Amino acid sequence: GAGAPVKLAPRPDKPLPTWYELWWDNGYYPGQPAADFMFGAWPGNMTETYYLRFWSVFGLALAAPFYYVANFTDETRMPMVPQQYPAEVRDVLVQRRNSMLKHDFSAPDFKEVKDRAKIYWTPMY
Amino acid sequence: TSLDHVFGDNSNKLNYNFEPMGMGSLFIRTMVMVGVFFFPVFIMINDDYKYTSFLDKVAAAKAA
Amino acid sequence: FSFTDATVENMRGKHDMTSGMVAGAVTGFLFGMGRPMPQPVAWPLAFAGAAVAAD
Amino acid sequence: MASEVVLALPHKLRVMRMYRTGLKELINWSANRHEWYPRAYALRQEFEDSKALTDREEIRKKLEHGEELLARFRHWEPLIKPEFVGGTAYSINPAQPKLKFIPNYDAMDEYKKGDHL
Amino acid sequence: MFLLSVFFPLLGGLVNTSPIARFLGHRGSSIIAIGCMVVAFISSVVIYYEVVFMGCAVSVDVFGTWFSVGTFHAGWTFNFDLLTANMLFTVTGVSMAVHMYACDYMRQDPHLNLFLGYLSYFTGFMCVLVAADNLLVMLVGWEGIGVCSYLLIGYWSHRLSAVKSAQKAILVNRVSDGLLMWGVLWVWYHLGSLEYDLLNVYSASGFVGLSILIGAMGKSAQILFHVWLADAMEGPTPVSALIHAATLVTAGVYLLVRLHIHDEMFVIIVGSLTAFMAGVFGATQSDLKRVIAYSTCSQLGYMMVSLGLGETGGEASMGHLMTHASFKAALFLAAGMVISGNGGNQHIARYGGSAHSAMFTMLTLMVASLSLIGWPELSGFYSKETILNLAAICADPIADVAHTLLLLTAMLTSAYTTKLFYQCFMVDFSGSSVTPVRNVLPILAMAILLLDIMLKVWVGTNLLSGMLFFLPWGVKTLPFGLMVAGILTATAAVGSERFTLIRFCGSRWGFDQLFARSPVNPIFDLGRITWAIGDRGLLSVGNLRA
Amino acid sequence: EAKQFTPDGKYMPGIFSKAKPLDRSTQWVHKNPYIEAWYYRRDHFENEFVWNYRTTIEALWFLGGFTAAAYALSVFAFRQADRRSGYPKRQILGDEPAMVLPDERQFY
Amino acid sequence: HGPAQTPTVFDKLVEVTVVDMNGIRHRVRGLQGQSLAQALVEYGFPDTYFFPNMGFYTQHIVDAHVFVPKEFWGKVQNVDPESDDGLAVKRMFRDIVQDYQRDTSFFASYITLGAEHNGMTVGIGPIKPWILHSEWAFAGVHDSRNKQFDKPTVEIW
Amino acid sequence: SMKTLADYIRWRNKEPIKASVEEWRPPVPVINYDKPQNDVLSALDKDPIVRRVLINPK
Amino acid sequence: GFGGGFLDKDSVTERVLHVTKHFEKIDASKVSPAASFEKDLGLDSLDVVELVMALEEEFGLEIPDAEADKIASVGDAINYICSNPMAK
Ligand SMILES: CCCCCCCCCCCCCCCCCCCC(=O)O[C@H](COC(=O)CCCCCCCCCCCCCC)COP(=O)(O)OCCN
Numbered sequence A: 001g002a003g004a005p006v007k008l009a010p011r012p013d014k015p016l017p018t019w020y021e022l023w024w025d026n027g028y029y030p031g032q033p034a035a036d037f038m039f040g041a042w043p044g045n046m047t048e049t050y051y052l053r054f055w056s057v058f059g060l061a062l063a064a065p066f067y068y069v070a071n072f073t074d075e076t077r078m079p080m081v082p083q084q085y086p087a088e089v090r091d092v093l094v095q096r097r098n099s100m101l102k103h104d105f106s107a108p109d110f111k112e113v114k115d116r117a118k119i120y121w122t123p124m125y
Numbered sequence B: 001t002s003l004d005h006v007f008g009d010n011s012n013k014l015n016y017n018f019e020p021m022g023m024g025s026l027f028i029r030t031m032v033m034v035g036v037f038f039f040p041v042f043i044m045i046n047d048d049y050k051y052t053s054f055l056d057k058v059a060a061a062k063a064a
Numbered sequence C: 001f002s003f004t005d006a007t008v009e010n011m012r013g014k015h016d017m018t019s020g021m022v023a024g025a026v027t028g029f030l031f032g033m034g035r036p037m038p039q040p041v042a043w044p045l046a047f048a049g050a051a052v053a054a055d
Numbered sequence D: 001m002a003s004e005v006v007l008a009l010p011h012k013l014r015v016m017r018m019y020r021t022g023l024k025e026l027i028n029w030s031a032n033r034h035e036w037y038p039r040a041y042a043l044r045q046e047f048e049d050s051k052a053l054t055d056r057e058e059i060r061k062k063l064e065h066g067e068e069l070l071a072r073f074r075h076w077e078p079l080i081k082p083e084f085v086g087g088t089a090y091s092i093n094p095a096q097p098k099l100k101f102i103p104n105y106d107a108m109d110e111y112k113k114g115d116h117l
Numbered sequence E: 001m002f003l004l005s006v007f008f009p010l011l012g013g014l015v016n017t018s019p020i021a022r023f024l025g026h027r028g029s030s031i032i033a034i035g036c037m038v039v040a041f042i043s044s045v046v047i048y049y050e051v052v053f054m055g056c057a058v059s060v061d062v063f064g065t066w067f068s069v070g071t072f073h074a075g076w077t078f079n080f081d082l083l084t085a086n087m088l089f090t091v092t093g094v095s096m097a098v099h100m101y102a103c104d105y106m107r108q109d110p111h112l113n114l115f116l117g118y119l120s121y122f123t124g125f126m127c128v129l130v131a132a133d134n135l136l137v138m139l140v141g142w143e144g145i146g147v148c149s150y151l152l153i154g155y156w157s158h159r160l161s162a163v164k165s166a167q168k169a170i171l172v173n174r175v176s177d178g179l180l181m182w183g184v185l186w187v188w189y190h191l192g193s194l195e196y197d198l199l200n201v202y203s204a205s206g207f208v209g210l211s212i213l214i215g216a217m218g219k220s221a222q223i224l225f226h227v228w229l230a231d232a233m234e235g236p237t238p239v240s241a242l243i244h245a246a247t248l249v250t251a252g253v254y255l256l257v258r259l260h261i262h263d264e265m266f267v268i269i270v271g272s273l274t275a276f277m278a279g280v281f282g283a284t285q286s287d288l289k290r291v292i293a294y295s296t297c298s299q300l301g302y303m304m305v306s307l308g309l310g311e312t313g314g315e316a317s318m319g320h321l322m323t324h325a326s327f328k329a330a331l332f333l334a335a336g337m338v339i340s341g342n343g344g345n346q347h348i349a350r351y352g353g354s355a356h357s358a359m360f361t362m363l364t365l366m367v368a369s370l371s372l373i374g375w376p377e378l379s380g381f382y383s384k385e386t387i388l389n390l391a392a393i394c395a396d397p398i399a400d401v402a403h404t405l406l407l408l409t410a411m412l413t414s415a416y417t418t419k420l421f422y423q424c425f426m427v428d429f430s431g432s433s434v435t436p437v438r439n440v441l442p443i444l445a446m447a448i449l450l451l452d453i454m455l456k457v458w459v460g461t462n463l464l465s466g467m468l469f470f471l472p473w474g475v476k477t478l479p480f481g482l483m484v485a486g487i488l489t490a491t492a493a494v495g496s497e498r499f500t501l502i503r504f505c506g507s508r509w510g511f512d513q514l515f516a517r518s519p520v521n522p523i524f525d526l527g528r529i530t531w532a533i534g535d536r537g538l539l540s541v542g543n544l545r546a
Numbered sequence F: 001e002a003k004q005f006t007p008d009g010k011y012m013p014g015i016f017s018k019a020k021p022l023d024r025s026t027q028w029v030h031k032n033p034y035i036e037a038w039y040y041r042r043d044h045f046e047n048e049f050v051w052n053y054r055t056t057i058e059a060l061w062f063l064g065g066f067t068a069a070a071y072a073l074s075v076f077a078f079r080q081a082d083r084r085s086g087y088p089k090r091q092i093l094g095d096e097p098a099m100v101l102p103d104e105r106q107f108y
Numbered sequence G: 001h002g003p004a005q006t007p008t009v010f011d012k013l014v015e016v017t018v019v020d021m022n023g024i025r026h027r028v029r030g031l032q033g034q035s036l037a038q039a040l041v042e043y044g045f046p047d048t049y050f051f052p053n054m055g056f057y058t059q060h061i062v063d064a065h066v067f068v069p070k071e072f073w074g075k076v077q078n079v080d081p082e083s084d085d086g087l088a089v090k091r092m093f094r095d096i097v098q099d100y101q102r103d104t105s106f107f108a109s110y111i112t113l114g115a116e117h118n119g120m121t122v123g124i125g126p127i128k129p130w131i132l133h134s135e136w137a138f139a140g141v142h143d144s145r146n147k148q149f150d151k152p153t154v155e156i157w
Numbered sequence H: 001s002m003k004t005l006a007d008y009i010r011w012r013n014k015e016p017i018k019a020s021v022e023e024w025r026p027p028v029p030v031i032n033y034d035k036p037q038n039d040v041l042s043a044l045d046k047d048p049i050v051r052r053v054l055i056n057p058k
Numbered sequence I: 001g002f003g004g005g006f007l008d009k010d011s012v013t014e015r016v017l018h019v020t021k022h023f024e025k026i027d028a029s030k031v032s033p034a035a036s037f038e039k040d041l042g043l044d045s046l047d048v049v050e051l052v053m054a055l056e057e058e059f060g061l062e063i064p065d066a067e068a069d070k071i072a073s074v075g076d077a078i079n080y081i082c083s084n085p086m087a088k
């Protein structure tokens, strides 16, 4: 239904604040802050202290299991070794740092392939 | 004012003083922003430090 | 100014622009003392800038 | 606690706004309307148990506690009818206001249509 | 036939937005748009059968060279290989039904042909994105769908919240676009070319995969970038269906599957955290479109983890993308029909009964919902179970936590999708407007997407369907039990008394509110400093009064 | 209801005419006094600068702080580029006599 | 708009009583919005009473030294003593008036005639000898019948 | 005391003067109960009124 | 249809009289236009709050709170609803 009524926003009839360009007045009622939740009451009357306080527990509750398995569990937990390939096929497949074949602890060059899968950031000269 | 009895009037005003943020809040949030949005700079600085300390170890134990 | 310049000169063992900047900061702080506050910073800057332009 | 508008109300209208907002917040927290009906009845029975009071201190304590409860249980996603403020259909395709037209503006006073210097 | 899949929706957009449309009107422009999509879909079907089944890739030099300075050489060239044919079939097939739906859904809009032209432009830039053979024509497609998403989200421009949603989508995606551009610079510098077939990376410098992952996280709406996706519901329902099915959100996953240059730890962690977050977000919403938007974010998390698993995982990721587009577009179209049958209301507390909708809308919602929750031997069952079983046998210890997060997410998805059906149809009526839609065009639009759901079961996406990864019956049939648990819980309609957890999750963990002041207000205040204290202050030189 | 054109073209100014002619200034805005005052004040905001505590502190930590950060980053990038190109230490402004400008006839 | 009065010049007329340096009272008529120095020039006062406004970009304005009573002190226009206009007024007080200055001393171009000046009595103050250039000076004696109004131009050069 | 160049320089150490005039505020919709909630855990969540009118009715 | 966006007086009157009679204490014969809620009908303040919320439900309106405070009789409600362009 086009043409529905909508209330208009009043023009300023008093001296303006110095930093008035933080209100978005598009012509209709109501205007909004330039970014939502920057000022004014938040939905549900929550505050920044509420979210920071709940997150100070909830963030370590989500980061806890990843740390535990990345530091206290290794490749030998699996009941089987990775998929086996002929040497000419395998030798190019494990050149990728991305590959899941570097977790083959039965390979004769398991350590050397793991030492070549260390992530670097600045390319050396 | 022909729609004020339908959608509300203009009597309730916005409670905001349009004032700048506090100095400590601004400084702390800006430092956090620099750390988050410029993390390659810190990664590469750490790479340079880890590289030069290894050459220090080589030059120390080599000439002995 | 002259005593602070030659003192920093003899203390650092070399001739460079640091002695002039320090002497200018000292002299301008002497001039700017007791005045409202852009001035105890502004006058050391002006005397150090005169030393830097001189060099 | 109530806002600065509700704190300026007369006592009868203050209690009326508290009951009305309680019914609306019970709508917002319920799954359906048929879930809402006995909660509305229970809220009505809750207000009827303080009707015959006279001590203004006890009245003030009950009123302030209920306003704290309503500030606590303000729903983060209220149910608004779509064509009103905060609804999803407000301010979509309004009729255009009258805009004025100037016919043949380029033909009026030709050769002198720039900026002065 | 090959260039007809890319050019021709762009031609439909050009026709419907130019002054040619002044002579056609609404009635003629609807015909032009539907025909211009039917031709492109037919071309994509031919391309799909030639490239996927008979294995013959085709490379087309379209418009010569774009720009070539030094060793930086960008050409106007396409290449149609397996991934490109998959994406073109999916995009054109979904966009055809969305055009057929939009020609009836937006019938009472005053600027209907402008809306249809914007939809066609959006589809055409998506086709340009997936048909490109190098990175720069891909960036043409990337920014083209970004711009058309801005035009379509803020279509109802007299509403301020729609305008701010469109601006928010632009800005959130602009951060990741910057990181993706820097990653393209890394790739070209250390490999020497821009074409995909010459980008074979075994061991690169870390910034490559990270920056390309951030650029993909923007478009695919992963963790700390998902904030624009929920607010994009301000646009009309066809826009949401095309954003969440075929265009835009599937572009980052396509880019990561194509390049395969990521580091798997970041990808697995981001994907599993996104899946769990969007699962708990959609469980606590009452806006009918926001639940479906969060389910889209959750499935994109599943695909992210899968492409983290490996090359087989990359194939499974593309397969889940392809099957997800059909039932997601069907879900959005059915939700739009339910909304229109209930007077524009989007709150699921004001629905109920079987009077406000057609029989076909209820059937469409039921079948697409059953495919989404992984009901056995439907379309989503094959792809989702493939990803879950591939995550159960990965030798990375990080994938152990990711699999648990995915199983919890599966139970949450079967909870809130069953809640969406239950509130809409099974409970007693609690609205007041009953205007059910039974037009031919939206019903045929829904029937086409249901036919594609059947087609994915009958003809698989790839060769993985029917391959058996050897798992015990306990590990294999657990997601079915999690689906049943979600269904039973949602039909029991039970709730908990832990209201602070309920309001922490229902307010979506406060990400928007925390972003309103951790970068945004500081950017405004630093601008105040640089202008007032710097330009007007410290650097300002005054006059000499005399 | 003005008539600014004859039936065969020929614009007429209507200087002495009663009806108001449509012209260039027909759609000029009606000025709001407070908006004009706020824009005037923001146009002359250099008169409001003062060396108080907050101005001095923010001009030190943000303006001078980020300028020093950018100078440090520029020197870091210059030195790292010279190391990754096979060059020795090179003479920037105020850095003692050293190598500037590599020779094209030389292999580094 | 109705039967309201046609605008007359008498509605905008301002009358000021001026006492010249010989003590002779004069009736001076002006219009609203006109400065006082202009009304004094157009009345027919001699050219020895007037001198240049000594600001930059305003020496083509003629000005006179007037004595203003305490009731009309607040209807002289305000001049910032720190601005350049303030330094112009300071130069005029320093060079032209000198020790003829009183607490009622103003300058006539800084008085804009309105209805509040109606009936105000002012007096012409004495000035010291001055020179702008060879074609505009004052030797110090008010012995000349040449009116300021009869000069065709005011020449800064 | 001594006359110097510091008397002739317009130093920028004067605070700008504000006025007591009421500034403009845009209208906003009414929020009836808007007390800011900072506590994650509150006794109001387990209030007997909440139990009587929300949890307990059948 | 009829009216420039506003419902007619008679159907609004009929619907308001229908909504008003849903109390146990109300005698139906006393329900008429221009009848006071408290003095004539015998409803307290909570009953009036419920009646205005029911009229919001009946005509599909979000009545602002200051306007709902002013409604004190059947004729006040009828005159308010007939001045709504959004009343369906
Ligand atoms: C405001 C934004 C609007 C966005 C608009 C849509 C998005 C556009 C994005 C990409 C724009 C690229 C446009 C390029 C224009 C022509 C550039 C090539 C110039 C030229 O001489 O090239 C020849 C022209 O061929 C030809 O052009 C083919 C010959 C004619 C047969 C086909 C006719 C075209 C039908 C297109 C239908 C509508 C499509 C809409 C895009 C091809 O030869 P070469 O020298 O390059 O040799 C190499 C292969 N032989």
Ligand SMILES: CCCCCCCCCCCC(=O)SCCNC(=O)CCNC(=O)[C@H](O)C(C)(C)COP(=O)(O)O
Pocket: D011, D012, D015, D022, D025, D026, D046, D047, D050, D051, D052, D053, D054, D059, D062, D063, D065, D066, D067, D069, D070, D073, H049, H050, H053, H054, I043, I044, I045, I046
């Ligand atoms: C989510 C749930 C949140 C909980 C919301 C809060 C629930 C707490 C409710 C209990 C608190 C109270 O009763 S608050 C205290 C209310 N009791 C009184 O004010 C004393 C009676 N005084 C009177 O003037 C009138 O009877 C009056 C009733 C005002 C008007 O009714 P009428 O004009 O007809 O007469």
